[PDB]
Design a binder for this molecule. Structure first.
Ligand SMILES: *[C@@H]1O[C@H](CO)[C@@H](O[C@@H]2O[C@H](CO)[C@@H](O[C@H]3O[C@H](CO)[C@@H](O)[C@H](O)[C@@H]3O)[C@H](O)[C@H]2NC(C)=O)[C@H](O)[C@H]1NC(C)=O
Ligand SMILES: CNC(=O)[C@H](Cc1c[nH]c2ccccc12)NC(=O)[C@@H](CC(=O)NO)CC(C)C
Ligand SMILES: [Ca+2]
Ligand SMILES: [Ca+2]
Ligand SMILES: [Ca+2]
Ligand SMILES: [Zn+2]
Length: 415
């Protein structure tokens, strides 16, 4: 599957509810319209956009929406990370506000897709023309997808491109060649892991549309307009199966037919993640199944965590290469300092030192015996991302103990 998927959640501030005289149906119908155009705008980029959530703050805003863009994007991002994402599985979120932002009409982080807090942007309800707001949105999500503003030798035709630093009064639905390459550049170097999965039809709240290249409720298949459709098993115009086709979508559908029962359709990540198989009568691969966390794995050197068996040895290896292993216990005592690298967790942007007992769950230390030198307590630190180098959650920190939220606790009570 060449296509990536952005499971989007939109949020409407109270300023907009009031501006629309409380007509929630009107607001909703309008969001469906806008997102539909965004999806069309993103075909070129081999990216699909599906609205999987819509929250209207008709009672009161859950953050203070100020005309100061930066403040508002940051708060929305925090709220999204500590609230929205906590209870709603989605990849990106945008806030629409009738409040007139200062210097701009939209603002978003760059190259932050899937980031719990930064995978967001704010959009001003600049115009009643859905194509216009659809442009702002595609633009802010563009930045999220690692795209920067066009400049110099960038082109999308004799039209006004989407990523220009200013919106044109004659907005087009085109991304520049520069936007394209920079986007997939981000998609390669950085891994937007959350835009790989295809959203289920029941996950989309917009009204199903046959032809948007998205399989929704009431459709057996969907390959877009009859002109772009390259799916032999589907009748584009009706989204119905045609000919000797027993299916036209799914990881268990090969050449318009169910794959033989027992066919693996999702490989196993580890002894903690049992692979999945096709039934022979279904086209969809069953949902990913992981063994229960806490299950002993890798010959007792670890315990299962979300389908993987994280252990300090592999972590040292991935961080420093060969000839590196778990440092002696004394090394980890550095974690009691609460200094720039030695700590267990963060709370309100504060580095919390490890309690004497949670020392194996903070910054990771490895004894380095790779050629050339000696180093008993090697540790990795980069203010580019302070979390890198930290012991992973679910890692065995002692006999019968695992790391959970920066604490070394009993495996038995950990899950
Ligand atoms: C995005 O597409 C651009 C082409 O559409 C591409 O290259 C730029 O394209 C123009 C013509 O479209 C080239 O030609 C112009 O400049 C030369 C040299 O002065 C003249 O001889 C021509 O008559 C014309 O005026 C540009 O030279 C060329 N610029 C670059 C960057 O090489 C962009 O590069 C494409 N973007 C990317 C990076 O993929
Ligand atoms: C009507 N107002 C606009 O078009 C201003 C113009 C502008 C603000 N700061 C600038 C710096 C350099 C060049 C132009 C501007 N730009 C915007 O609203 C753009 C802001 C942006 O980069 N959002 O991600 C989003 C917009 C493209 C939809
Ligand atoms: Ca997703
Ligand atoms: Ca559809
Ligand atoms: Ca599985
Ligand atoms: Zn921009």
């Amino acid at each position: 599957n060449p296509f990536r998927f952005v499971e989007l959640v939109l949020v409407v501030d109270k300023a907009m509810v009031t501006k629309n005289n409380g007509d929630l149906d009107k607001i909703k119908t309008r969001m469906y319209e806008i997102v539909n155009t965004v999806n069309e705008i993103y075909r070129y980029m081999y990216i699909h956009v599906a609205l999987v959530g819509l929250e209207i703050w008709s009672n009161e805003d859950k953050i203070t929406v100020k005309p100061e863009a930066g403040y508002t994007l940051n708060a929305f991002g925090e709220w999204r990370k500590t609230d929205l994402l906590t209870r709603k599985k989605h990849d990106n979120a945008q806030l629409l506000t009738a409040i007139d932002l200062d210097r701009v009409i939209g603002l978003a982080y760059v190259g932050s897709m899937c980031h719990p807090k930064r995978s967001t942007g704010i959009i001003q309800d600049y115009s009643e023309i859905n194509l216009v707001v659809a442009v702002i949105m595609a633009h802010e999500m563009g930045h999220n997808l690692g795209i920067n503003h066009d400049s110099g030798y960038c082109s999308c035709g004799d039209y006004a491109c989407i990523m220009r630093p200013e919106i044109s009064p004659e907005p087009s639905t085109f991304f520049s060649n520069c936007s394209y390459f920079e986007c997939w550049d981000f998609i390669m170097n950085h891994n937007p892991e959350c835009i790989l999965n295809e959203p289920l039809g029941t996950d989309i709240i917009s009204p199903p549309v046959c032809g948007n290249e998205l399989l929704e409720v009431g459709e057996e298949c969907d390959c877009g307009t009859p002109e772009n459709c390259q799916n032999e098993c589907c009748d584009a115009a009706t989204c119905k199966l045609k000919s000797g086709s027993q299916c036209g979508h799914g990881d268990c559908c090969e050449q318009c037919k169910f794959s033989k029962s027992g066919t693996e359709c999702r490989a196993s990540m580890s002894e903690c993640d049992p692979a999945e198989h096709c039934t022979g009568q279904s086209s969809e691969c069953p949902a990913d199944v992981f063994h229960k966390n806490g299950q002993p794995c890798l010959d007792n050197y670890g315990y299962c965590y979300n389908g993987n068996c994280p252990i300090m040895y592999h972590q040292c290896y991935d961080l420093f290469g060969a000839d590196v292993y778990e440092a002696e216990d004394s090394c980890f005592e550095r974690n009691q300092k609460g200094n720039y690298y030695g700590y267990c967790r963060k709370e309100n942007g504060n580095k919390i030192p490890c309690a004497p007992e949670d020392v194996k769950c903070g910054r990771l230390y490895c004894k380095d015996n790779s050629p050339g030198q000696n180093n008993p307590c090697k540790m990795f630190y980069s203010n580019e991302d302070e979390h890198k180098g930290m012991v992973l959650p679910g890692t065995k920190c002692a006999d019968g103990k695992v790391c959970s939220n920066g604490h070394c606790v009993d495996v038995a009570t950990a899950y």
